[PDB]
């Protein structure tokens, strides 16, 4: 439950009641594709397929 | 209302009752389909379709 103070006499205000989640290190993954390694492509069929 | 008759001194039969439609002559009717002339088909496309 968030709760919030004023202070008259430096002007500011504090709001309380939240929860911590801070970023401290990394995790690192490797993302792959396959793929397919092709030059050529032989075909001199001009269908539109 | 077809009927028969029997004749024993002659062993034949005659069936009455019939009505005629003789094909006394002919008509004469022509019949036409409108043809694209047509040579060539110029395309070199290999398309399936």
């Known amino acids: 439950n968030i709760t919030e103070e004023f202070y008259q006499s430096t002007c500011?205000?504090?709001?309380?009641?939240?929860?911590?989640?801070?970023?401290?290190?990394?995790?690192?993954?490797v993302i792959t594709i396959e793929l397919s390694?092709?030059?050529?492509?032989?075909?001199?069929?001009?269908d539109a397929k």
Not at 12 to 29: F, P
Not at 37 to 46: A, S, W
Request: with cysteine.
């Open 12 to 29: 500011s205000a504090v709001s309380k009641g939240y929860l911590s989640a801070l970023r401290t290190g990394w995790y690192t993954s």
């Open 37 to 46: 390694n092709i030059k050529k492509i032989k075909c001199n069929g001009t």
